[PDB]
Amino acid sequence: XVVD
Amino acid sequence: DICPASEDESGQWKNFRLPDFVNPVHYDLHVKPLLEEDTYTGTVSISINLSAPTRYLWLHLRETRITRLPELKRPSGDQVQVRRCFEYKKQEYVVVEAEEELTPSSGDGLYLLTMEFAGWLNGSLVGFYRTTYTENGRVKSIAATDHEPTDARKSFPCFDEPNKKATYTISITHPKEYGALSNMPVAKEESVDDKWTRTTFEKSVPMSTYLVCFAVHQFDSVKRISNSGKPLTIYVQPEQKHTAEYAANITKSVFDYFEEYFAMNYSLPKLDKIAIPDFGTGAMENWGLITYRETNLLYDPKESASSNQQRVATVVAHELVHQWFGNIVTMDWWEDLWLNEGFASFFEFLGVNHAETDWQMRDQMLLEDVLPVQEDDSLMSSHPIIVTVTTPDEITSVFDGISYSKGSSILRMLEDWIKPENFQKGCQMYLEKYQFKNAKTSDFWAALEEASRLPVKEVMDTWTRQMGYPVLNVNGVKNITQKRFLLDPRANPSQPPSDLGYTWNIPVKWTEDNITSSVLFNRSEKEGITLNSGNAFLKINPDHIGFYRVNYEVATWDSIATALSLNHKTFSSADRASLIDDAFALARAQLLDYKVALNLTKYLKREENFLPWQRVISAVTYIISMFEDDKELYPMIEEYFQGQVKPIADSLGWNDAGDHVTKLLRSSVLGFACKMGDREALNNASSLFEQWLNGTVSLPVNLRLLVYRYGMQNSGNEISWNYTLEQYQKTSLAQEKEKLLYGLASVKNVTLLSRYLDLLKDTNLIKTQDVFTVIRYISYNSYGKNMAWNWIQLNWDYLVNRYTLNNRNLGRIVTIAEPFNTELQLWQMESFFAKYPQAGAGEKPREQVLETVKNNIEWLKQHRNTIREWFFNLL
Numbered sequence: 032x033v034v035d
Numbered sequence: 036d037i038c039p040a041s042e043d044e045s046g047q048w049k050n051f052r053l054p055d056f057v058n059p060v061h062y063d064l065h066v067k068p069l070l071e072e073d074t075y076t077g078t079v080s081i082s083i084n085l086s087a088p089t090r091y092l093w094l095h096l097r098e099t100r101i102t103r104l105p106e107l108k109r110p111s112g113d114q115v116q117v118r119r120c121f122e123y124k125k126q127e128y129v130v131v132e133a134e135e136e137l138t139p140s141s142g143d144g145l146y147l148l149t150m151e152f153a154g155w156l157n158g159s160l161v162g163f164y165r166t167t168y169t170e171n172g173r174v175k176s177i178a179a180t181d182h183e184p185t186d187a188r189k190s191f192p193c194f195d196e197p198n199k200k201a202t203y204t205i206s207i208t209h210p211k212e213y214g215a216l217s218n219m220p221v222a223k224e225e226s227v228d229d230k231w232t233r234t235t236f237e238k239s240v241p242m243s244t245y246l247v248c249f250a251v252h253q254f255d256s257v258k259r260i261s262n263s264g265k266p267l268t269i270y271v272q273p274e275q276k277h278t279a280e281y282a283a284n285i286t287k288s289v290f291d292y293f294e295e296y297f298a299m300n301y302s303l304p305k306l307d308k309i310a311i312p313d314f315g316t317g318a319m320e321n322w323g324l325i326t327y328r329e330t331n332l333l334y335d336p337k338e339s340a341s342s343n344q345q346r347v348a349t350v351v352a353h354e355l356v357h358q359w360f361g362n363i364v365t366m367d368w369w370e371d372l373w374l375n376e377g378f379a380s381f382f383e384f385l386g387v388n389h390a391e392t393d394w395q396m397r398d399q400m401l402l403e404d405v406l407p408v409q410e411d412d413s414l415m416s417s418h419p420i421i422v423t424v425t426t427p428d429e430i431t432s433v434f435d436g437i438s439y440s441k442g443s444s445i446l447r448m449l450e451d452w453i454k455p456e457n458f459q460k461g462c463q464m465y466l467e468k469y470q471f472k473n474a475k476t477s478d479f480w481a482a483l484e485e486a487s488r489l490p491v492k493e494v495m496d497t498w499t500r501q502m503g504y505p506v507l508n509v510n511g512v513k514n515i516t517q518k519r520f521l522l523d524p525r526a527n528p529s530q531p532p533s534d535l536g537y538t539w540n541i542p543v544k545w546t547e548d549n550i551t552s553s554v555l556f557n558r559s560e561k562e563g564i565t566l567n568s569g570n571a572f573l574k575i576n577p578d579h580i581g582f583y584r585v586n587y588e589v590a591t592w593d594s595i596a597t598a599l600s601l602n603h604k605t606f607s608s609a610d611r612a613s614l615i616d617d618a619f620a621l622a623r624a625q626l627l628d629y630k631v632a633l634n635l636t637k638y639l640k641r642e643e644n645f646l647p648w649q650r651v652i653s654a655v656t657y658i659i660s661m662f663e664d665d666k667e668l669y670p671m672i673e674e675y676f677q678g679q680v681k682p683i684a685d686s687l688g689w690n691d692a693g694d695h696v697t698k699l700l701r702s703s704v705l706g707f708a709c710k711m712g713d714r715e716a717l718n719n720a721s722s723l724f725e726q727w728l729n730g731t732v733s734l735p736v737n738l739r740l741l742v743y744r745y746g747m748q749n750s751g752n753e754i755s756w757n758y759t760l761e762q763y764q765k766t767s768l769a770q771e772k773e774k775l776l777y778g779l780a781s782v783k784n785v786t787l788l789s790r791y792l793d794l795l796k797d798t799n800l801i802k803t804q805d806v807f808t809v810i811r812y813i814s815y816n817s818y819g820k821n822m823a824w825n826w827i828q829l830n831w832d833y834l835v836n837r838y839t840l841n842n843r844n845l846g847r848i849v850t851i852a853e854p855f856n857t858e859l860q861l862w863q864m865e866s867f868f869a870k871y872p873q874a875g876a877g878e879k880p881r882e883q884v885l886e887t888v889k890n891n892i893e894w895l896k897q898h899r900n901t902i903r904e905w906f907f908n909l910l
């Protein structure tokens with residue numbers, strides 16, 4: 032995962 | 036219907052975890068999408084290593100249905116007879132029962148299990164799905180997958196645990212106008228009809244299910260070749276082809292840098308990156324086929340900001356780290372998720388620092404991870420780095436600040452303590468040992484212990500198997516003691532129970548007159564230690580390299596304030612930021628009088644560096660928001676901080692001049708000036724905005740966001756709101772789109788914000804990926820703080836139905852309530868939570884926001900007069  | 040649901044609990048399938056004795060080796064996977072129908076079908080053949088007599092075989096499946104009664108093969112080759120199949124909802128299992136039961140796979144032979152399945156491509160951003168975009172006025176389609184953590188099971192039936200590694204050969208049957216991508220290169224393409232192509236990909240290395248990825252697209256591409264000779268290509272809409280250039284650059288530079296740094300070959304023959312037009316997370320590290328949200332991948336030097344540039348560089352770097360950390364070596368269980376995300380959050384900075392030399396990335400770790408997570412991990416509702424997770428909702432929740440930022444931060448401490456050289460060599464050995472297998476946290480400590488012979492397990496365990504961190508109390512310049520640091524003074528410092536009792540082994544570093552010393556502070560030194568030159572000052576925790584706060588004696592703190600006033604450059608930029616950050620957190624915690632803290636800000640008219648300003652702004656943002664409605668305190672705080680930024684705001688001016696860090700500083704410094712009500716900065720924003728509305732002028736890239744926000748806030752009306760909405764639709768660049776949404780959220784008009792909230796239900800206007808972003812923006816608006824909060828309440832059933840309780844972003848949306856600071860607001864929150872007590876992935880965020888709001892109420896009671904006095908006496 033970036034989770035934004 | 037074909038495997039009906041059954042409530043039959045009497046079997047091993049009632050267990051949340053898959054059994055030990057069933058093991059996949061190879062997946063034969065075929066899917067055929069009906070793109071225009073939003074459906075797909077597929078069959079899967081799995082080779083299974085059975086270890087124990089069992090009359091049932093079971094594996095994960097959600098939403099997607101089995102369409103044909105599945106068929107099982109003995110390792111000999113015979114057809115095993117099947118009595119029944121049935122779905123077990125409660126633990127997301129499809130279960131098949133043999134007439135009989137059979138025995139382990141003793142030789143090299145394996146069972147083969149084959150099942151046909153049908154699912155949907157619509158109404159979701161997980162599993163296998165379709166979305167659209169517009170090219171030359173035509174609506175086009177693209178289908179892709181997204182699995183982490185527990186959504187592989189939606190795409191196809193599988194053994195959906197990260198440690199159930201198996202090998203993949205994927206094939207897809209698709210319309211011939213489309214290409215097909217997966218983890219591996221294409222092996223063979225064969226015509227099915229004159230209309231359909233079957234694309235088959237070559238065998239994969241053993242991997243986790245969450246990493247399996249495929250796509251069907253009509254994208255163009257930008258290409259680069261590694262030092263290894265392997266093609267690195269970024270897939271991108273033809274319209275947006277120019278905006279893939281930067282990411283292409285960074286992928287090459289960072290790929291080449293990492294392969295050398297980890298001393299390990301990238302495991303696959305190619306690597307692809309692609310941004311899905313509607314994508315539920317930021318980015319996903321699928322081996323060889325990394326997926327992105329456009330804001331994290333696509334960058335226009337003529338339109339995008341340096342903030343955007345750095346975000347693109349960092350996410351690409353992050354996702355590349357996973358090719359080694361996460362993909363090659365994966366955690367055994369999600370409890371050890373930090374082994375993936377913490378490591379990615381750490382090395383991302385090393386990656387980008389190679390690619391971009393003057394970005395001062397190593398320092399920026401403080402702004403991005405260390406200091407922000409020190410806020411998080413000072414709450415009672417934090418959790419230890421190694422986290423017990425027992426449901427899919429709990430699993431998906433821990434993709435959070437603790438896994439990423441604290442993970443990053445304790446690795447940063449470790450490297451410094453253990454020395455970079457040995458840290459590097461240790462990582463390599465870990466990577467050699469567990470390659471294509473799984474690791475636990477214990478496995479990583481032991482690896483580094485071989486590289487240092489330092490007591491890594493003993494020391495690092497304390498930072499890892501308990502939540503929280505310590506404050507170091509200074510007595511007499513030189514004596515330190517440790518105590519757990521909690522933001523709430525009333526909280527019980529011993530809860531929740533921890534074997535280690537909230538004492539740590541702290542690697543402590545300090546600076547005696549430009550010279551640097553080191554000591555490990557043992558847990559068992561209950562009465563503290565003494566730091567080994569007749570000294571008058573001791574700089575403890577240089578660059579805030581350790582994951583703790585230092586509380587000096589008040590007199591020391593007083594002398595630091597004076598030292599900053601006289602010559603602030605006495606301290607490094609990081610050291611300044613750190614002392615400031617600590618002081619203000621200590622004050623927040625009622626461990627330091629606020630007068631002492633505020634005294635540290637007096638010097639600021641001469642402050643010129645990025646790091647201190649960022650941490651000052653963070654600290655002031657909190658205090659100012661607590662006093663928003665205080666007609667007495669607010670103007671005085673505004674007036675002061677307006678005066679403190681004014682010189683640097685003026686000095687830098689409204690123009691994109693200077694290096695990276697300078698341009699970031701100007702952004703945040705001009706923004707703060709605007710926030711603090713500086714008439715001249717607001718007039719700059721309004722003037723530029725008015726020019727942008729004339730439709731020609733392209734705004735300076737690092738000022739745009741500020742101009743849209745403060746411009747709309749100060750002179751926005753229906754005409755300019757409508758215009759901005761049209762412009763948002765018209766631009767292809769996601770990075771610009773996002774700025775424009777923030778702009779539209781800034782208007783000081785209830786009717787227009789109400790229209791905007793209504794747009795959230797319209798998927799032709801707001802993409803599904805963007806809904807929570809927009810809600811959060813609106814929540815920042817003086818009117819919308821309450822509008823967004825009310826809207827998510829009224830529309831809670833609708834959001835749950837659209838996203839499901841397993842959606843991370845939905846669980847987190849309650850944090851828009853963070854600025855709440857009254858008993859009334861707290862009661863509203865609690866009443867809403869009690870009405871909708873199924874929180875799913877929102878369970879922790881709810882706990883956290885309640886603790887925050889409770890702290891706010893306390894904070895006001897304790898500090899209003901003190902903070903009043905400091906400002907009244909000063910102004």
Ligand SMILES: *[C@@H]1O[C@H](CO)[C@@H](O[C@@H]2O[C@H](CO)[C@@H](O[C@@H]3O[C@H](CO)[C@@H](O)[C@H](O)[C@H]3NC(C)=O)[C@H](O)[C@H]2NC(C)=O)[C@H](O)[C@H]1NC(C)=O
Nearest residue numbers: 681684685686687688689714715716717718719720722723
């Ligand atoms: C965008 O922001 C700028 C601030 O960064 C504004 O520029 C400032 O405008 C002020 C008014 O004209 C000037 O005030 C003068 O300051 C000087 C000090 O060097 C003194 O002589 C005077 O006290 C004062 N003028 C008078 C007549 O009393 C600022 O000097 C000036 N410049 C700077 C660099 O700060 C811009 O005006 C603003 N732009 C818009 C379009 O609003």
Ligand SMILES: *[C@@H]1O[C@H](CO)[C@@H](O[C@@H]2O[C@H](CO)[C@@H](O[C@@H]3O[C@H](CO)[C@@H](O)[C@H](O)[C@H]3NC(C)=O)[C@H](O)[C@H]2NC(C)=O)[C@H](O)[C@H]1NC(C)=O
Nearest residue numbers: 593594596597630631633634637904905906907908909910
């Ligand atoms: C650390 O913070 C301390 C507490 O604020 C500072 O001490 C204070 O300095 C103030 C000046 O900034 C004094 O304010 C004055 O208060 C009296 C009434 O008590 C008024 O008559 C004056 O008008 C007012 N001054 C102004 C300019 O309006 C405080 O009296 C004083 N408080 C105490 C208890 O001494 C320290 O200076 C500060 N340490 C630093 C900067 O190193």
Ligand SMILES: *[C@@H]1O[C@H](CO)[C@@H](O[C@@H]2O[C@H](CO)[C@@H](O)[C@H](O)[C@H]2NC(C)=O)[C@H](O)[C@H]1NC(C)=O
Nearest residue numbers: 072073074098154155156157158159160836837
């Ligand atoms: C994708 O679209 C299909 C087709 O409309 C959805 O299935 C329908 O669901 C509604 C209730 O939600 C029923 O009234 C229909 O009878 C269903 N149609 C069929 C053919 O089964 C499906 O739910 C959508 N997928 C998602 C994830 O929302």
Ligand SMILES: *[C@@H]1O[C@H](CO)[C@@H](O[C@@H]2O[C@H](CO)[C@@H](O)[C@H](O)[C@H]2NC(C)=O)[C@H](O)[C@H]1NC(C)=O
Nearest residue numbers: 751752753754756782783784785786787788790
């Ligand atoms: C908020 O925006 C609305 C929408 O433009 C404004 O209402 C308009 O007011 C003008 C005259 O003031 C009318 O001619 C329009 O027909 C109105 N539109 C609607 C939809 O009612 C409103 O004035 C703005 N309010 C504030 C406080 O700024």
Ligand SMILES: *[C@@H]1O[C@H](CO)[C@@H](O[C@@H]2O[C@H](CO)[C@@H](O)[C@H](O)[C@H]2NC(C)=O)[C@H](O)[C@H]1NC(C)=O
Nearest residue numbers: 752753754755756757758760786789790791793
């Ligand atoms: C701003 O845009 C809104 C929405 O497009 C316009 O208001 C709508 O206009 C349509 C067609 O004229 C009506 O059917 C709707 O009832 C209107 N309101 C809403 C809430 O949709 C509005 O005319 C535009 N205003 C300006 C000044 O351009």
Ligand SMILES: *[C@@H]1O[C@H](CO)[C@@H](O)[C@H](O)[C@H]1NC(C)=O
Nearest residue numbers: 279280281282283284285336
């Ligand atoms: C990519 O790098 C080349 C040189 O390697 C450079 O000329 C070009 O401007 C870069 N492209 C970007 C930053 O988009």
Ligand SMILES: *[C@@H]1O[C@H](CO)[C@@H](O)[C@H](O)[C@H]1NC(C)=O
Nearest residue numbers: 262263264298299300301302
């Ligand atoms: C390891 O890297 C070198 C780089 O040139 C390459 O020649 C070699 O084939 C790689 N090893 C494997 C197993 O692919």
Ligand SMILES: *[C@@H]1O[C@H](CO)[C@@H](O)[C@H](O)[C@H]1NC(C)=O
Nearest residue numbers: 510511512513514562564565
């Ligand atoms: C600090 O601790 C040591 C050891 O207990 C002691 O010698 C010293 O007096 C203490 N206090 C101060 C103020 O230095």
Ligand SMILES: *[C@@H]1O[C@H](CO)[C@@H](O)[C@H](O)[C@H]1NC(C)=O
Nearest residue numbers: 490540555556557558559560
């Ligand atoms: C911590 O204390 C234990 C007590 O048994 C000791 O063996 C160990 O060496 C200590 N570690 C240090 C001081 O680094």
Ligand SMILES: [Zn+2]
Nearest residue numbers: 032033376379
């Ligand atoms: Zn990641």
